[PDB]
Design an enzyme around this catalytic site. Sequence first.
Site, PDB file in Angstrom:
ATOM      1  N   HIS A   1      -4.950  -9.487   6.478  1.00 51.37           N
ATOM      2  CA  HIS A   1      -3.699  -9.122   6.935  1.00 51.37           C
ATOM      3  C   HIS A   1      -3.358  -9.687   8.233  1.00 51.37           C
ATOM      4  O   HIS A   1      -2.354  -9.411   8.728  1.00 51.37           O
ATOM      5  CB  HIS A   1      -3.694  -7.487   6.645  1.00 51.37           C
ATOM      6  CG  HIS A   1      -3.737  -7.081   5.355  1.00 51.37           C
ATOM      7  ND1 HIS A   1      -2.557  -7.274   4.517  1.00 51.37           N
ATOM      8  CD2 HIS A   1      -4.511  -6.304   4.677  1.00 51.37           C
ATOM      9  CE1 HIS A   1      -2.819  -6.581   3.482  1.00 51.37           C
ATOM     10  NE2 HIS A   1      -4.024  -6.177   3.452  1.00 51.37           N
TER      11      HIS A   1
ATOM     12  N   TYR B   1       0.718  -1.078  -0.009  1.00 53.65           N
ATOM     13  CA  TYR B   1      -0.057  -0.008   0.076  1.00 53.65           C
ATOM     14  C   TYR B   1       0.883   1.161  -0.044  1.00 53.65           C
ATOM     15  O   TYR B   1       0.406   2.285   0.823  1.00 53.65           O
ATOM     16  CB  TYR B   1      -1.058  -0.053   1.345  1.00 53.65           C
ATOM     17  CG  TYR B   1      -1.804  -1.242   1.092  1.00 53.65           C
ATOM     18  CD1 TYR B   1      -3.015  -1.372   0.203  1.00 53.65           C
ATOM     19  CD2 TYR B   1      -1.824  -2.042   2.149  1.00 53.65           C
ATOM     20  CE1 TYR B   1      -3.732  -2.355   0.306  1.00 53.65           C
ATOM     21  CE2 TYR B   1      -2.818  -3.231   2.058  1.00 53.65           C
ATOM     22  CZ  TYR B   1      -3.841  -3.177   1.229  1.00 53.65           C
ATOM     23  OH  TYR B   1      -4.428  -4.126   1.124  1.00 53.65           O
TER      24      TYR B   1
HETATM   25  N1  LIG Z   1      -4.338  -4.329  11.656  1.00 52.37           N
HETATM   26  C1  LIG Z   1      -5.184  -3.188  10.868  1.00 52.37           C
HETATM   27  N2  LIG Z   1      -5.826  -1.960  11.346  1.00 52.37           N
HETATM   28  C2  LIG Z   1      -6.423  -1.150  10.427  1.00 52.37           C
HETATM   29  N3  LIG Z   1      -6.370  -1.181   9.252  1.00 52.37           N
HETATM   30  C3  LIG Z   1      -5.647  -2.264   8.681  1.00 52.37           C
HETATM   31  C4  LIG Z   1      -5.116  -3.371   9.314  1.00 52.37           C
HETATM   32  N4  LIG Z   1      -4.373  -4.117   8.660  1.00 52.37           N
HETATM   33  C5  LIG Z   1      -4.464  -3.706   7.332  1.00 52.37           C
HETATM   34  N5  LIG Z   1      -5.297  -2.700   7.193  1.00 52.37           N
HETATM   35  C6  LIG Z   1      -6.021  -2.029   6.070  1.00 52.37           C
HETATM   36  O1  LIG Z   1      -6.692  -2.476   5.339  1.00 52.37           O
HETATM   37  C7  LIG Z   1      -6.827  -2.194   3.944  1.00 52.37           C
HETATM   38  C8  LIG Z   1      -7.350  -3.308   3.274  1.00 52.37           C
HETATM   39  C9  LIG Z   1      -7.660  -3.155   1.503  1.00 52.37           C
HETATM   40  N6  LIG Z   1      -7.428  -4.155   1.043  1.00 52.37           N
HETATM   41  C10 LIG Z   1      -9.139  -2.818   1.376  1.00 52.37           C
HETATM   42  C11 LIG Z   1      -9.504  -1.357   1.835  1.00 52.37           C
HETATM   43  C12 LIG Z   1     -10.953  -0.720   1.801  1.00 52.37           C
HETATM   44  N7  LIG Z   1     -11.763  -1.632   2.467  1.00 52.37           N
HETATM   45  C13 LIG Z   1     -11.645  -1.048   0.336  1.00 52.37           C
HETATM   46  O2  LIG Z   1     -12.607  -1.890   0.262  1.00 52.37           O
HETATM   47  O3  LIG Z   1     -11.171  -0.420  -0.507  1.00 52.37           O
HETATM   48  C14 LIG Z   1      -5.837  -1.513   3.883  1.00 52.37           C
HETATM   49  O4  LIG Z   1      -5.919  -0.246   3.532  1.00 52.37           O
HETATM   50  C15 LIG Z   1      -4.865  -1.857   5.044  1.00 52.37           C
HETATM   51  O5  LIG Z   1      -3.994  -0.494   5.394  1.00 52.37           O
END
Ligand SMILES: Nc1ncnc2c1ncn2[C@@H]1O[C@H](C[C@@H](N)CC[C@H](N)C(=O)O)[C@@H](O)[C@H]1O
Length: 258
Positions: free
Chosen positions: A124, A11
């Site tokens: 993640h 990211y």
């Molecule tokens: N421990 C965590 N706490 C908060 N956010 C997280 C964590 N781990 C991963 N993420 C975030 O989860 C997001 C996952 C993305 N694949 C999707 C983002 C969003 N939900 C979308 O549909 O566009 C990323 O932007 C990460 O930075």
Amino acid sequence: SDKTFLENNQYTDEGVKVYEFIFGENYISSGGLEATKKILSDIELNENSKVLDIGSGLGGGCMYINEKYGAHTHGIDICSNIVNMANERVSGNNKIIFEANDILTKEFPENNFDLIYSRDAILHLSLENKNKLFQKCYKWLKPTGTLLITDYCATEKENWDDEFKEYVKQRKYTLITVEEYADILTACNFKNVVSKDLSDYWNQLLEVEHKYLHENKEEFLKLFSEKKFISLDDGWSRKIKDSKRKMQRWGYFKATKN
Ligand SMILES: Nc1ncnc2c1ncn2[C@@H]1O[C@H](C[C@@H](N)CC[C@H](N)C(=O)O)[C@@H](O)[C@H]1O
């Protein structure tokens, strides 16, 4: 450590913009706006509702929920750079908040949210942390509240091939089965746990996205590079193959506190 890994690899700012190209404005996950409309199609909220979006990304989900329902939306994302981008996408709206934080250390009051929502974020988290997170979510939901999740899942580990093992390892994903996922929610005392394997629908979203990428290649190359195009193209090709043969799955989960 997790924060730096995500910000510096998957990211990065450019990585985020590449995802937004293929998913659509304000989205960096499966199906963008149209999938979000479908996922929320049976959800009832209003201007007095409070919503948490775990892993809120560029904020598209929060924007849509606030637009559709008038609800208060609070998005948490661990990547500071992504939250900075999200904040540039919304102005003059005191019912949308984006906050940079690890959801695992964030504190909220018990019985706080009408909806806890998460889209392709929990992959993640380690297995131990998925369980810890869902315990927190149980506390944070209002008695009348709902948990609504899409996430990347997989066939049992025993079935994984070399390429899939490498995919998961390089990204540091923890992918469990749809059944194991549902079992975690049940163990956390959620009620009315509904799991759906939406891999077929996911495959359809992937195909539309793949076609879009191909038909907009010239613009992509102008914005990015051929190297990035090939990586993205091949990545979608593998997801399409692996979802078709059920190696990689797209899980949907809905549950309630009571
Ligand atoms: N421990 C965590 N706490 C908060 N956010 C997280 C964590 N781990 C991963 N993420 C975030 O989860 C997001 C996952 C993305 N694949 C999707 C983002 C969003 N939900 C979308 O549909 O566009 C990323 O932007 C990460 O930075």
